[model samples]
Target: HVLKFKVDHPFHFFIRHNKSKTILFFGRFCCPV
Candidate 1:
C-alpha cells in the first residue's frame, strides 16, 4: 500500500552489504531512468 508509487513510477532500487551490523558497500538507484 505504500510502495504503489515505486511500482508504477520510474523509481528504481538500491542495495548494500553489511557484516556484524557494519556497512561495507552502499549504492543509490533512485534516478528516474
Candidate 2:
C-alpha cells in the first residue's frame, strides 16, 4: 500500500514488507559519484 500527503511542501514516505514502518530520509548526502 502506498500513501501520499499534501501539505505546504512535498515529502516521501514508505513502509517495509516486514511489517515495520520506516521513514526514508534520502537525499544527496555525498556529492561527486
Candidate 3:
C-alpha cells in the first residue's frame, strides 16, 4: 500500500556497487525537494 505514493510523485532512483552486491534506492519529491 505504501508503494502507491511513489507512483503518483516525481522520484529519483539510484544504483550503487557494493563489495558483493548492488544497492538500490529511491527518493520522492525529486529535483528541488
Candidate 4:
C-alpha cells in the first residue's frame, strides 16, 4: 500500500512502535525538518 520508487542516493529507515497505546511511526534516519 505504498508508492515505492528508486532513489539515486542512500536512504535509511526508522520505525518506532508503542505497545501500550498502539502507535507507530516511520521516517528517515536523520531528519531536521
Candidate 5:
C-alpha cells in the first residue's frame, strides 16, 4: 500500500500491510526551520 499527507509540525505514524496485518514500516515528519 501507499500513503501520503501534509502537516505543519512533527508527526509519527506506522505503515501496515493488509495481507499480514503487521507493522512493516514507520514514518515521521519534522519542520525544517
Candidate 6:
C-alpha cells in the first residue's frame, strides 16, 4: 500500500505489503469517525 488508499476521513482502510514493512495488527487515530 503506497498511496491510492483514498481520503476524506470516511475511515477504515488497509491492503498492505509494499515490501512487507509490516504492522500486521495494531491501531492508530485520535479523532473523528
Which candidate number would show the highest lDDT if scored against the true structure? 5
Candidate 5 wrongly placed segments (more than 4 Å): 1-6, 31-33
Name the better of 4 and 5 by lDDT: 5
TM-score result, candidate 3 = 0.25
Candidate 5: worst-modelled 10 consecutive residues by lDDT: 1-10
- In the range 1-33, model 3's lDDT, one tens digit per residue, is 455454454666666677756766644554562
Instruction: Sort by lDDT, best first.
Output: 5, 3, 6, 4, 1, 2
Looking at model 1, report the run of 10 residues with the lowest lDDT sum: 9-18
How would you encode candidate 1's per-residue C-alpha lDDT over 1-33 as one tens digit per residue?
A: 575443554443444353556555555555655
- Candidate 3, residue 24: the lDDT equals 69
lDDT tens per residue, model 2, 1-33: 888754444444344455455544534323333
lDDT of 5 by residue, 1-33 (tens): 778665767998789998988999987867575
Encode model 6's per-residue lDDT on 2-32: one tens digit a residue. Answer: 8685555545545566697675655554466
Count of steric clashes across candidates, in order: 0, 0, 0, 0, 0, 0
lDDT of each: 0.50, 0.45, 0.58, 0.56, 0.81, 0.57
3 against 5, candidate with superior lDDT? 5
Question: How well does candidate 2 match the true structure in TM-score terms?
Answer: 0.21
Q: How many backbone clashes does candidate 4 have?
A: 0
Worst 10 residues of 2 by lDDT: 24-33
TM-score of 5: 0.42
Task: For model 3, state the Cα shift of residue 30 in Å.
Answer: 7.8
Error of 3 at 16 (Å): 0.9
Best-fitting candidate, measured by TM-score?
5
lDDT of 1 at 5: 42
Flag regions of model 3 displaced more than 4 Å.
Answer: 1-5, 20-33
TM-score of each: 0.28, 0.21, 0.25, 0.22, 0.42, 0.17
lDDT of 4 at 9: 52
